[PDB]
Design a protein around this ligand. Structure first.
Ligand code: NAI
Ligand code: NAI
Ligand code: UPG
Ligand code: UPG
Ligand code: UPG
Lengths: 454, 323, 460
């Protein structure tokens, strides 16, 4: 049967865009996006959405109330839907066994049990959340216990900031399901939904475990690249080579690809580190410590890169930063989003705060309450100010610290900035956005240090 | 670490894969970089040339006969020497990463071929050098990782040193757990059992055996006392003897002239090189003449699909990245 | 040519105050102005009760306070009037962030340099007496080269100090040597020579060494290294003595008679204290980890670890002889200063021994002849103090009913106590743990009296 009603438990960075794009593409399907956070739902029904995603505002306003809905009423959405997406979060457990390593599956378990408490007849439950391998066996055991529901895997590959383009023109779609009769009917049903706008060559079908594991493996390879090119940047700094030339060189070899080779202060975002940690913690239970400590190097290098960079700043400021004003330009974890999950800016700020530095922080899309929240747990009242515009942040600053590649940081007037900074002045370029702009800054008198230059 | 023993350099008074500023001091008391990346010579992805200036352009002038200036990259010399290494790093690291994934698959019922397929369709990742195996071989890869590791130990960059050292370690793990897998399947002992080793080259379509995983699987099985019968189409007999020597070799190694005679009375067939001729073998013939139960360890994913036939023929088959 | 006639010293502490009082005493024709932010301190200098205890200091200060020696909170005006500016502030170990517990906190220095280049014009010599990491001057030079003014020409020197507390006045008046470092340029050597001219009034010329800034800074550290290494080395031997039957004092004598080794700083102890020895080693250990010298770092780290071991060994001997329980047991701590003839407590082994016994729930009664009472209370805090710490007005009150007497500071008076009397009112068995060897030779008398006496480097 053709899927006519779709429910998505979890209206976050996945459930919101992914269902907006399903509705814009499939006008004969009813897509209700639900969530327990009533303020989140209400924001999804607002002129100011709860997440900044380019193109997302257009897409939502094009369907909300035609076939795109956002509701707090979790039950009826499931009861009447033909397909329930699970797109809830799977953080790293902060407690109990595996604290700091294992993924917390309590929010998935919550969906699985509310689905069966609120549904009759035939429905397709799809796991889009990034789970461990064989987690779809767990939903199956639940459904075969409190007894007709099928369980599928359809991970997402959207990266935040480019989520709309990536959802309209995906490299591939991954659908994993049972190798049974009942399962292969449910898979080709989900294919039908995607086939409205994804070509069939770019829809990949496998079994449940191979799918759950492909998502982790892909994120490992991606994260590994960054760390790999990040490690080269420290190599460059010690041999006077240049990480951008080396990266450009590496990337011309077609078998390597030219993507994901931009050195940086450190990868951030909701998923990479938690997924790597997840896979490592998987490996211990499976008695696979080599695989475990192999991928663990992807995290160690990231942590190194951030620390090395944080120390770069303190060392250069004549080894002390207590009571010194420093500007942090960029708090989002990447450009063109307002998500600050695991942003390297948190980790540099927290390092600089431990030295007693007074921070002035600016970011175009990140709301101030998030920064205050991210930097706390007061120490924040004393040391952290949040600036309305950048020139305010650098007024009387000893140093300018760029942690996010917002294109506008080139556009700044460093003549003006230099006139009002304490002397001597420094710029610490954590994203290489200022390449080529050096000689200017050098003549202006700024001392410019960046990732991958001696 | 790099055996730089220079002998090329001083004789002169462009490059090899090196860690050139030593040249400019010998010469101080025309030095560019131009490393290599088979018959690849004809349509190179890119031609690397590094210096400090018309000399880069003389060497651009020579390549330009068949490579367009778009595909020719000039840089400083340090960045040229580094770029050669880091490429091989990223390449070798892809292989070790996918090898690590295979172990994961074997323990969870995923297929490394399905997982690699899904991985590589991410254009950012790219789908080259993602075919799991028993271990990467060849002159440059392991040499180049170690070389860079030493270079890091001597620049006080141990975080970096030990990060890339995992590319070697995981390759070592992939080779030993395969060997360990052969031995465990044959009831924990392999002493005096004939085992057929199929394929001694490091990749297919070469005679090159340098650092071939076949060397290390064979040596592992030699430490147990297995009777190895080795056959490889192009690798010369005497190179096998030399590669396993340093007597242990004479007591345990037969170099067979064809695969069917090396598989006769064997407990296991261990495929280490991806020669296509191994796919086309009469495996129903092999199995009648092998001891029972017969085994096939496919360290190259060359028997994919044929499993049902082989399994029904009565063969017991184990392959990388699929239980 | 150029003569220093006005000296400002930012920092009125154990260095700034004595070094300037001596300078002023020997040079009637130079105006020495010692400034500090701490108004309660400055005011104590202008009082008859000086803020620190140094034998002879009260004499030297009173000799020229109001004539050519002054103490003022007016940090701004002294800078602007001075021909020479001493930076003499503290460089503690960072208690936070990167290098916590290792690296030196340069914030106070950096504060001086910016306040100097703000409040100053014309020609001044900026001199770094505080103990800094190698190259720390170079940071001051850069601060001056970016915040420059018309006709401002601030010169930067290294003039490290070697006085020991408890001998500061004697050391400042006949120092083994003076160390001055400056850039090997025209401008620097001018300023180097102008600082020599000052010291030349009372110090022999040959004893005035001139080097570059680095060499100067590093020398101060290395000397402090070599010094502490001797203590930790003899303390190491003392351990081997209690295990073998040797006697550290006998061994120390035999060692120091070799003139290549020399016979000073071989007096084994519960462990070295004072503000500089531990931090200066750690500072250098930290400095090596940035210089990619891991072998040198761990070489010097041993000085600190041996001293931490000498202390904890002693604390454990006490606790073991009280059968590993000390709860509510009275114990007398004689000596809280880090050496005799001083009020200073910074890093005094007495603190650490008191902390080890407070973790056992003992009732400590502490007596010191010079350390002020609230200092001890501060030093033992961060109430555990309320329940466990009494501060004694005299040693006999401190030993009244005690299980043990722990001598930590070699105050000459402890050796003269009425130990017959102490013993009568102690609980038996009645221990004396001598952490300073001040009671050697009284072992026979103390033993017939009934005391259980133990000491560093003597076998039990
Ligand atoms: N952010 C990204 O780029 C991508 C993330 N993923 C994965 O997709 C998942 C979704 O992550 P995000 O959307 O970024 O996180 P999120 O925190 O923004 O979304 C989770 C939402 O689900 C709601 N929720 C949780 N449990 C619920 C329950 N029992 N009932 C109803 N609502 C519930 C929460 O209130 C929250 O608003 C994660 O597992 C992530 O690893 C996969 C691909 C891309
Ligand atoms: N005490 C000793 O035996 C010797 C120490 N040194 C070195 O000399 C330095 C001075 O140490 P001490 O005098 O013993 O320490 P201290 O703590 O007694 O003296 C420092 C004084 O400077 C004041 N101060 C700090 N920053 C200031 C500022 N910006 N403006 C004005 N006043 C400020 C403080 O309030 C304090 O009164 C240390 O770095 C030490 O390593 C060198 C030789 C001997
Ligand atoms: O060359 C690069 C590329 C990325 N980054 C950093 O990597 C982090 C994450 O970037 P990105 O990959 O876009 O993060 P996400 O937006 O979370 O997307 C990733 O994680 C998602 C959730 O697992 C997957 O859906 C996507 O495929 C995957 O790209 C950011 O902080 C970037 O600054 C670099 O430093 N250098
Ligand atoms: O998907 C793959 C691809 C290769 N391999 C194995 O890994 C090795 C790769 O060898 P190969 O790449 O052919 O080695 P070389 O022929 O020495 O050349 C490589 O190393 C050179 C030196 O670093 C570079 O110039 C080349 O671009 C690079 O392909 C072989 O043993 C293969 O069997 C796999 O296991 N999976
Ligand atoms: O043989 C000895 C000598 C000293 N100490 C102890 O070691 C510590 C240090 O003693 P001392 O050297 O007098 O301390 P300071 O008074 O701080 O002076 C030292 O530290 C100063 C600051 O760096 C330097 O200027 C001096 O040269 C150097 O002697 C004290 O707690 C002593 O009890 C011993 O245990 N055994």
């Amino acid at each position: 049967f053709e899927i006519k009603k779709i429910c998505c438990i979890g209206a976050g960075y996945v459930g919101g865009p992914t269902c907006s794009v399903i509705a814009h593409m499939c006008p004969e399907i009813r897509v209700t996006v639900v969530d327990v956070n009533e303020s989140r739902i209400n924001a999804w029904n607002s002129p100011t959405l709860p997440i900044y995603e380019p193109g997302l505002k257009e897409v939502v306003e094009s369907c909300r109330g035609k076939n795109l809905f956002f509701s707090t009423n979790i039950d009826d959405a499931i009861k009447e839907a033909d397909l329930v997406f699970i797109s809830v979060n799977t953080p790293t457990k902060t407690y109990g066994m595996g604290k700091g390593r294992a993924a917390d599956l309590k929010y998935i378990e919550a969906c699985a049990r509310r689905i069966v408490q609120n549904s009759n007849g035939y429905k397709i439950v799809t796991e889009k959340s990034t789970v461990p391998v064989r987690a779809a066996e767990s939903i199956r055991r639940i459904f075969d216990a409190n007894t007709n529901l099928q369980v599928l895997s359809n991970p997402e590959f959207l990266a935040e900031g480019t989520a709309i383009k990536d959802l309209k023109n995906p490299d591939r779609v991954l659908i994993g399901g049972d190798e049974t009769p009942e399962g292969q009917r449910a898979v080709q049903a989900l294919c039908a939904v995607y086939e409205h706008w994804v070509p069939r060559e770019k829809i990949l079908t496998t079994n449940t475990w191979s799918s759950e594991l492909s998502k982790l493996a892909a994120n490992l390879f991606l994260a590994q690249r960054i760390s790999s090119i990040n490690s080269i940047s420290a190599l460059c700094e010690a041999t006077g080579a240049d990480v951008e030339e080396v990266a450009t060189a590496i990337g011309m070899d077609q078998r390597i690809g030219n993507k994901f080779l931009k050195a940086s202060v450190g990868f951030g975002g909701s998923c990479f580190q938690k997924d790597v940690l997840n896979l490592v913690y998987l490996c211990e239970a499976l008695n696979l410590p080599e695989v475990a400590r192999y991928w663990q190097q992807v995290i160690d290098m990231n942590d190194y890169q951030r620390r090395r960079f944080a120390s770069r700043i303190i060392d250069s400021l004549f080894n002390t930063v207590t009571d010194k004003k420093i500007a942090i330009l960029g708090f989002a974890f990447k450009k063109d989003t307002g998500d600050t999950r695991e942003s390297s800016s948190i980790y540099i700020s927290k390092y600089l705060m431990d030295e007693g530095a007074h921070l002035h922080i600016y970011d175009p899309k990140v709301p101030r309450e998030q920064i205050v929240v991210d930097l706390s747990h007061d120490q924040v009242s004393r040391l952290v100010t949040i600036s309305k515009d950048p020139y305010e942040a650098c007024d009387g600053a000893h140093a300018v610290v760029i942690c996010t590649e917002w294109d506008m940081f080139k556009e700044l007037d460093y003549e003006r900035i230099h006139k009002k900074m304490l002397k001597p002045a420094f710029i610490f370029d954590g994203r290489r956005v200022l390449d080529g702009l050096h000689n200017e800054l050098q003549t202006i008198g700024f001392q410019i240090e960046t990732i991958g230059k001696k």
